[PDB]
RNA sequence: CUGCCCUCAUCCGUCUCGCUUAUUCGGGGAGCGGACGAUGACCCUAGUAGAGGGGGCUGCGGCUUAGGAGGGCAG
């Protein structure tokens, strides 16, 4: 499926999911952190203590 | 304008800090705004402009870019 050029995340041409301006929520989120680029926890639970 | 970091994460501790609130108002109680701190990670390379590697996300096609808003610093 050569859909290159048409975004599927939002549905707007010119860019793709990788460059989707709506890239934030409503996706999947396995166990990564899109706030500190962390690998394991979630952004919603991303924070520091000591 | 771009990079990084922090805050909204119904987060925490600190702050002679600011605001609001209590039968629409003050150095206390609480919530929020600002600073500090979970790239677990950045470093290196050759022909140092810039470019690439794992690496950013992806419908794998890729491009190598940018990603909601406010503050600090750098050019
Ligand atoms: Zn899009
Ligand atoms: Zn995180």
> Which nucleotide is closest to A16, CA to C1'?
B58
In angstroms, the CA A41 to CA A48 distance is 12
Q: How far apart are CA A40 and CA A19, in angstroms?
A: 23
Cβ neighbors of A21 (< 8 A, separation 6 or more) are A10, A15
Residue count of chain A: 50
Q: Which neighbouring-strand residues pair with A6?
A: A13
Question: CB less than 7 Å from strand B: which protein residues?
Answer: A 1-4, 6-9, 16-24, 27-28, 32-49
Asked whether the beta carbons of A16 and A7 are under 8 A apart, the reply is yes
Which single residue is written with the structure tokens 């549905």?
A: A11
Structural domains in chain A, CATH included, are 1-50 (4.10.60.10)
Determination method here?
Answer: NMR
Q: How many A from CA of A23 to the centre of ligand 2?
A: 17
């Amino acid at each position: 499926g050569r859909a290159r050029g048409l975004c599927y995340t939002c549905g707007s041409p010119g860019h793709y999911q990788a460059q989707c301006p709506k890239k934030r929520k409503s996706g999947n989120s396995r166990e990564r952190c899109q706030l500190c680029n962390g690998m394991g926890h979630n952004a919603k639970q991303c924070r520091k203590r000591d």
